Design a protein around this nucleic acid. Structure first.
Ligand SMILES: Nc1ncnc2c1ncn2[C@@H]1O[C@H](COP(=O)(O)OP(=O)(O)O)[C@@H](O)[C@H]1O
Ligand SMILES: [Mg+2]
Ligand SMILES: [Mg+2]
Lengths: 1544, 16
RNA sequence: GUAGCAUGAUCAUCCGAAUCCUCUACAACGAUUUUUUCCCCAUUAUUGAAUAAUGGCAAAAAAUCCUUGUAGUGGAUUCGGAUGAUAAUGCUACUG
């Protein structure tokens, strides 16, 4: 609205008086009291602008109901310009936190809601009571007893007593109930509780006449004669109903929660049976009170409610009983309609027939009601008339609605004037009469009344107060007037002029009704005069009686930080926390209360226990409050319960289960507390675990630096120093055929080459290679050969030869490549060896002195060929040649010399008449011209393979006879002669692969040394080395008695320990991206399983006083990729990883070659300019031999031109290009996905486990700061992880547990193990829903470690045994083998379900269904399962009693024995056949193309449309399912069965 | 009584 | 050396599947709590008449929490399918 809303004369004085002093305003309803309230709120607009800390405040507008709060909120919002905050319990402020509570506070000036919400906000210290300006209270008469208003007011007493906000209460009625006599004491109680003085108008003739515009109604009464006769049909109905009651009590359903008295003195019926009996009793009362036809209307509502309840009835027995009730009600409705039609024969006109039936088959009071209506409205205009009718019962409203609809349709006069509607409280009843959710609707009954669509409203007291209703003119009361408040408010509702207040009552109660109405009129008049004549007191300043008003109860306790715990909220807090603990359906969260006994009372308490009552509070076993708590002695059991809950919640807060704000703590508080202990290192990387926003860009992957191993670092030999020469060897593993003997013979010559170093090199593993012609092995000499470089020119020649090797022979040169003079990173030389003084292998000074640069093959012509000397067979024997005449510019290697053969000899194959010479002319005569020395010899040559990366076995049909079927014979005079030891050449192409693999092997050896030193093992098998292995089951490289596990055996016996060899470390380092023969993915699974086990054990032995949920969350957080990456980066590992595929000509840097030093510095000095340098710019520079040999730095003009070219990329498309993919290797940088590091950590852990065992591997976690191990218990981080994890609850010894476990020997014989302690089995068998047990905790704490133990054991077995099968399916096999449904099948196979000490309604039914289904399948895995559903708790208890067996034995070997003994058939079934894929295999099927729609679960059923393809067709199928994803799974199972049948 | 009696069909409201 | 075909791996883009979830708005569910009212009963003070005290049994009103479903998203992990294009391998023709 706007500013036209003008207060009257009394509102101004009311505001002025309220400003000076607190008080409760008392005016009749509809007098504008909300307007004067907001006007008061205007006067406190001083501190709403400023924030809390700056000195500002806010306001509180209080309401008792959600809808009234919303209405007044929108009213004030439209009536002012304040930021109106609206908060209710339904909105979702339950999980609101500090920052986004405070911003909401600072973004609003006035707050509205329900009393509980604001009370909770205040007690949780979100604001201070002294930080408030004024708290407006509405419907203040509610504030008695333990009402939230009084509780909230008490905080004023307990808070600071100075600078306290103003308080004002609003009401039109002051008294609730039948407490009329002695009004003054109640009024004074209202005065003191709200610490205010009531103010009311007294200046009569000025504005009493004014505010009487909300005029009082005229009240009339109409009587009806009593009915006494009882129809026979009624007693038939009663007999049927009572026999149905007897049957319902007799009939059996599953175990149900137990209800009893409010004081718990006497037992009670089960909830659902009580519900149906209550419905039947309500129906009987309806039919007694209203007659026969009304029952005919209401039986339809009974039918629809029973049908809906059956539809939502999950339990089969509940469905059965609801169906039985439906049949009974259907018979009742049949008899009722039969009697209804029994008198309809008289008149055939439906209108008058139904009308007279209504007046005939109804009680007389309803008849008088109907005549009252008919003569009241008397066919007036419908829009004008707006009447109200009040009734007590809920179903009464719907029944009278049905009767009114039928009558209105039966009265044409009223068929167009009355459009009734009915509405009731929150326990809503479907207004429909036919079926559930027939159509959607968006208008409330109240809304339709407000819009004139409903001129008549049927309602209980729900519409009495608050809800804004326009001025009505008629109100009718059917049920007897009960309370003063409802009477006065109802008569106040009739606000318009000449409004009629009407009520009906029986004749014999007329005098009683007269007494009640006169009593109420007296109660109003004496109140009015008492206010008119009250004593003038200011604000009830008698603080003494103010405190005495509340001292009677238990004094609330407040802790530090200002948080205060209200005793009246103790039940709510405790029950809410109990609800926070996860549980199944029947799994009770309610703390099972109990009433003590007098003998027990004085057995536990003193003599005072006899005077008053004491009770006990228990705790469901899931929580840690296994110790029971007893309340203080209290007179009434009510305050006894309050005290019990208060003490219990105080103890809970003391334990820290309650947060400081006195609310149960979520996992967020747990992780926040743990972060500064276990996730401290994240801060150094700018991230934190609590930062949930990190869940956005986890896919991003970072870069890292690289550095050569320490031996290769700055190891260029110096002139005048000692140097180490390390020989290479080449042994051809393949046997050679006739077409390959050249390579086999050549590489085995004693003349080999060596790598020259100045630091010592450790022992290296023998290395396998994959040639184009066979398999190869490489070994490096252990004892180096010693030389001293006496001549600096010898070193210069060595450097020139090493540089020219890569520059020319292997075609690795680049325009920017420069020999490194700085000699810091990866600097060393490789030098050839010649047969020296016998055993000595000196240097081939000849080759380096001659082949400084390879000469250029020139096209010699005939003219220059005449005087050229003849070819010597020795000059050409085993030397490098090339065909300069032809287009082929590559080099060639000769095999043998054909002295006898000569030109003009015929080619043997396919050209027996055509000779080599004439063919040579016919081919390239235009280029060669002619051949001189026609009588000379020829030679035999074979190609040299251009491939350089020999890691991967190039599997294929080489066809050894056909690959070299052609034989190549050449005239020596026609080819260039590189006189060179060809064997050295053909060895030289394999150099780069050896160099790279040994470069990574050095890192591997360094890591092996580090992890042997840190774990302190220097025993005999430390030394030596083993030949490197290769895998076959790695995809690309295609070409009774339980057996004890070796890992456990080595962990218990040191005799089987084995030293870790370089090969395993290197494989752990080689990423799958860098596709060599091996990779780490086979070790990754073992690493992951061991890490999971270690984290589980450590957390259990460290935080044993925590529930399962937080433990699971933290354990999952620990092994997350982020944490592994963060813990590994600071471990200095990643810069020594093998990830990049080795392509030398473009993605590798030679050892002796680097960039120019100046440009290297510029790159390492201008990060702003580093990102723009592109490979084209690098190739732009043209560095001759001078630049790459004598300087190491480009020319300054060339420097300027190169930098100009680099800068020119900004204005071109080259700007912003991700050059890192091309130039990172030029400065020893690389980018690696985070998944790779997450894998390599577990890869290292896997080998460290495999070679040594669990106990030694435990130290590795603390080495990677995985867990901050405690030095106070040194054995924990080493051995107590297999010895610890228990507490007091597994210490007490008693034979009573044999009572819980019946025929335990049968289960033990079925399982195979014997328990020294049965307590552990009971704990693992302790399902959460089992109150009767009080000796041990639940089974979650056992299942948590059972999961880890089982998965690790199964992973160890599959890794050690299932060898020849790739990891990519090993992960699938382990996931299938650890599946919960498989565990359930195992459990039912040995029938362990019988011993599950659990109780639950739906769980028992579902386990029965599962077990009988498995019996039908005969205890065999149906690979998944087509059954409706599977019980998770079943697999849970099995895998928990696994841990129970371990704990009873404390021996992993026995655990493996028992696990294998139950898993034998399933293991041999999964390891033989394809274990499982399912769902996905259909989607990626060759011809099956399944797609699905959205599944909808309906009660106990779910259907989904499965749109797939089969046998080149498209078929449509359905399947029985449980939920949406289970509907998809069932459809996929049916599709799988159809595909199998089609294939079969 | 089988059939309920008919209350006064003509009935003008009484005023307290 | 030259083409076609087949294959492996990868980026990019699109879509799908599995697991775990989050948020949104709506609906349903169950549990707990608070007020009020009637009826009846019990035990006491006293014995009949008559009272008083409480305590318990059914009805209306109001709040809170949990769960489930509806759909849209969004996110993490694994993974598949499709495709430009890139580079790698093998084979089958033309050969050199
Ligand atoms: N003096 C006045 N100035 C402004 N508005 C008034 C005045 N008197 C009555 N009204 C209007 O009449 C309405 C009375 O209804 P309301 O006060 O909301 O019911 P209740 O008395 O139950 O709070 C108010 O909304 C108010 O806007
Ligand atoms: Mg109306
Ligand atoms: Mg109001």
């Amino acid at each position: 609205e706007d500013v036209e809303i003008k207060p009257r004369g009394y509102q101004l004085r009311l505001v002025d008086h309220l400003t000076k002093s607190n008080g409760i305003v008392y005016l009749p309803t509809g007098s504008g009291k909300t307007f004067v309230a907001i006007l008061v709120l205007k006067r406190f607009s001083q501190d709403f602008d400023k924030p809390i800390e700056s000195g500002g405040k806010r306001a509180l507008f209080m309401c008792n109901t959600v809808e009234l709060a919303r209405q007044q909120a929108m009213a004030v919002r439209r009536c002012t310009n304040f930021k109106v905050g609206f908060y209710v319990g339904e909105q979702g402020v339950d999980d609101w936190t500090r920052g986004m509570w405070s911003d909401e506070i600072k973004k609003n000036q006035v707050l509205v809601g329900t009393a509980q919400v604001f009370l909770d906000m205040v007690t949780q210290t979100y604001v201070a009571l002294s930080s408030l300006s004024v708290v407006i209270i509405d419907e203040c008469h509610h504030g008695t007893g333990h009402h939230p208003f009084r509780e909230f007011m008490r905080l004023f007493t307990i808070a600071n007593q100075t600078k306290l906000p103003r308080v004002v209460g609003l009401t039109g009625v002051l008294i609730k109930g039948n407490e009329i006599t002695n009004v003054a004491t109640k009024l004074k109680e209202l005065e003191i509780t709200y610490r205010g003085n009531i103010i009311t108008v007294s200046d009569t003739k000025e504005m009493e006449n004014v505010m009487l515009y909300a005029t009082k109604p005229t009240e009339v009464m109409v009587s009806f004669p009593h009915q006494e006769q009882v129809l026979t049909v009624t007693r038939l109905i009663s007999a049927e109903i009572e026999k149905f009651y007897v049957s319902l009590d007799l009939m059996n359903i599953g175990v149900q929660p137990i209800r009893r008295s409010k004081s718990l003195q006497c037992l009670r019926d089960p909830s659902k049976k009580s519900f149906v009996k209550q419905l039947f009793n309500d129906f009987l009362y309806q039919m007694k009170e209203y007659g026969i036809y009304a029952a005919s209307i209401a039986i339809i509502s009974l039918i629809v409610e029973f049908d809906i309840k059956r539809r939502q009835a999950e339990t089969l027995s509940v469905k059965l009983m609801h169906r039985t009730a439906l049949t009974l009600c259907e018979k009742i409705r049949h008899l009722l309609v039969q009697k209804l039609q029994d008198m309809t024969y008289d008149d055939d006109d439906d209108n008058v027939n139904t009308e007279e039936v209504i007046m005939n088959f109804s009680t007389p009071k309803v008849q008088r009601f109907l005549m009252s209506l008919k003569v009241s409205f008397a066919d007036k205009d419908p829009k004008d008339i707006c009447c109200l009718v009040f009734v007590e019962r809920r179903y009464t409203c719907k029944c009278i609605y049905g009767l009114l609809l039928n009558y209105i349709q039966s009265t044409p006069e009223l068929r167009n004037v009355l459009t009734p509607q009915f509405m009731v409280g929150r326990n809503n009843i479907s207004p429909d009469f036919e079926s559930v959710l027939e159509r959607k609707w968006q208008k409330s009954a109240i809304q339709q009344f407000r819009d004139g669509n409903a001129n008549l409203m049927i309602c209980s007291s729900v519409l009495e107060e608050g809800i804004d209703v326009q001025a009505c003119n008629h109100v009718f009361i059917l049920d007897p007037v009960k309370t003063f408040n409802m009477y006065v408010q109802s008569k106040g509702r009739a606000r318009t002029t000449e409004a009629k207040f009407v009520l009906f009552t029986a004749d014999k109660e007329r005098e009683k009704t007269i007494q009640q109405i006169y009593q109420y009129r007296k109660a109003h008049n004496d109140i009015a005069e008492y206010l008119k004549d009250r004593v003038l007191e200011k604000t009830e300043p008698e603080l003494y009686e103010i405190k005495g008003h509340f001292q009677d109860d238990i004094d609330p306790f407040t802790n530090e930080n200002g948080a205060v715990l209200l005793p009246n909220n103790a039940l709510a807090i405790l029950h809410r926390y109990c609800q926070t603990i996860p549980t199944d359906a029947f799994g009770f969260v309610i703390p099972w209360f109990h009433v003590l006994q007098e003998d027990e009372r004085d057995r536990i308490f003193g003599v005072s226990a006899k005077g008053k009552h004491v009770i006990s509070i228990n705790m469901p076993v899931n929580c840690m409050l296994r110790d029971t708590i007893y309340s203080d002695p209290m007179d009434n059991v009510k305050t006894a319960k309050i005290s019990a809950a208060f003490k219990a919640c105080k103890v809970l807060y003391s334990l820290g289960e309650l947060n400081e704000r006195f609310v149960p703590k979520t996992l967020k508080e747990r992780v926040a507390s743990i972060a500064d202990v276990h996730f401290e290192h994240w801060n150094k990387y700018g991230d934190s675990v609590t930062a949930t926003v990190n869940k956005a860009d986890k896919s991003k992957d970072r870069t890292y630096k690289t550095e050569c191993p320490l031996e290769f670092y700055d190891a260029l030999p110096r002139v005048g120093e000692i140097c180490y020469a390390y020989e290479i060897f080449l042994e051809p593993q393949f046997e050679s055929c006739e077409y390959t003997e050249h390579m086999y013979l050549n590489l085995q010559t004693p003349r080999n080459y060596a790598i020259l170093l100045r630091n010592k090199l450790p022992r290296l593993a023998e290395m396998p290679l994959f040639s184009n012609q066979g398999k190869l092995h490489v070994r490096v000499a252990n004892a180096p050969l010693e030389v001293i470089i006496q001549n600096s020119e010898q070193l210069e020649l060595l450097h020139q030869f090493h540089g020219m090797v890569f520059r020319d022979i292997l075609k690795i040169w680049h325009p920017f490549f420069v020999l490194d003079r700085r000699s810091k990173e990866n600097s060393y030389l490789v030098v050839p060896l010649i047969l020296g003084a016998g055993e000595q292998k000196c240097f081939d000074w000849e080759l380096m002195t001659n082949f400084r640069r390879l000469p250029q093959s020139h096209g010699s012509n005939v003219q220059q060929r005449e005087q050229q000397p003849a070819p010597r067979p020795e000059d050409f024997e085993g030397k490098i040649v090339t065909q300069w005449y032809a287009n082929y510019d590559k080099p060639m290697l000769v095999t043998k010399v054909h002295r006898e053969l000569t030109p003009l000899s015929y080619m043997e194959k396919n050209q027996q008449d055509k000779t080599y010479y004439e063919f040579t002319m016919s081919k390239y005569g235009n280029r060669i011209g002619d051949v001189v020395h026609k009588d000379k010899f020829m030679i035999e040559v074979r190609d040299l393979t251009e491939q350089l990366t020999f890691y991967v076995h190039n599997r294929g049909k080489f066809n050894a006879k056909s690959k070299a079927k052609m034989k190549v014979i050449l005239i020596p005079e026609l080819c260039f002669n590189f006189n060179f030891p060809g064997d050295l050449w053909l060895k030289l192409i394999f150099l780069p692969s050896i160099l790279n693999r040994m470069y990574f092997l050095l890192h591997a050896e360094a890591l092996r040394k580090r992890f042997n030193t840190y774990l302190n093992l220097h025993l005999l098998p430390f030394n030596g080395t083993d030949y490197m292995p290769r895998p076959l089951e790695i995809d690309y490289s295609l070409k009774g008695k339980v057996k004890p596990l070796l890992i456990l055996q080595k962990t218990v016996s040191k005799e089987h320990i084995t030293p870790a060899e370089q090969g395993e470390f290197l494989a752990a380092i080689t990423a799958s991206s860098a596709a060599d023969v091996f990779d780490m993915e086979r070790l990754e699974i073992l690493g992951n399983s061991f890490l999971k086990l270690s984290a589980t054990l450590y957390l259990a032995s460290k935080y044993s006083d925590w529930n399962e949920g937080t433990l699971t969350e933290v354990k999952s957080k620990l092994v997350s990729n982020r944490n592994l990456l963060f813990c590994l980066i600071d471990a200095d590992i990643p810069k020594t990883l093998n990830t990049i595929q080795f392509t030398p000509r473009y993605t590798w840097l030679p050892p002796g070659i680097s960039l120019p030093h100046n440009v290297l510095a510029l790159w390492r000095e201008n990060p702003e300019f580093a990102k723009i340098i592109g490979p084209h710019n690098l190739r732009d520079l043209a560095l001759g031999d001078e630049e790459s040999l004598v300087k190491g730095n480009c020319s300054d003009i060339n420097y300027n031109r190169f930098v100009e070219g680099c800068r020119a990329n900004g204005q071109s498309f080259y700007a912003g290009a991700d050059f890192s993919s091309e130039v990172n290797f030029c400065v020893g940088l690389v980018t690696i996905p985070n998944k790779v590091i997450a894998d390599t950590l577990e890869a290292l852990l896997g080998v460290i486990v495999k070679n040594y065992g669990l106990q030694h591997a435990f130290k590795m976690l603390e080495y990677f700061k995985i867990c901050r191990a405690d030095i106070d218990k040194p054995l924990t981080q080493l051995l107590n992880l297999e010895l610890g994890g228990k507490k007091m609850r597994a210490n007490v010894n008693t034979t009573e547990i044999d009572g819980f476990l019946i025929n335990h020997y049968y289960l033990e014989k079925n399982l195979g193990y014997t328990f020294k302690d049965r307590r552990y089995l009971l704990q693992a068998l302790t399902h959460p829903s089992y109150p009767t047990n009080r000796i041990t905790g639940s089974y979650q704490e056992l299942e948590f470690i059972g999961n880890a133990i089982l998965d690790f054991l199964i992973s160890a077995y599959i890794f050690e045994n299932n060898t020849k099968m790739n990891p990519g399916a090993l992960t699938d096999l382990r996931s299938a083998l650890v599946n919960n449904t498989t565990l359930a099948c195992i459990c039912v196979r040995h029938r362990l379900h019988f011993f599950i000490l659990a109780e639950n309604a739906k769980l028992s039914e579902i386990i029965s269904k599962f077990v009988n289904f498995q019996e039908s399948q005969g205890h065999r895995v149906t690979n998944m399962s087509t059954n409706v559903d599977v019980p998770k708790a079943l697999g849970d208890v099995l895998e928990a009693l696994i841990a129970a067996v371990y704990l009873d034995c404390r021996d992993l070997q026995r655990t493996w024995e028992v696990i294998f003994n139950l898993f034998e058939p399933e293991l041999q079934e999964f390891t033989r056949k394809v274990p499982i894929n399912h769902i996905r295999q259909l989607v990626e099927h060759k011809h099956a193309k399944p797609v699905f729609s959205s599944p909808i679960v309906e009660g106990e059923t779910v259907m989904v449309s499965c749109q797939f393809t089969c046998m080149e067709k498209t078929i449509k199928v359905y399947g029985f399912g449980s939920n949406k994803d289970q509907a998809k799974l069932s459809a996929a199972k049916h599709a799988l069965q159809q595909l199998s049948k089609c294939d079969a | 009584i089988d059939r309920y009696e008919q209350v006064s069909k003509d009935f003008e409201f009484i005023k307290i």
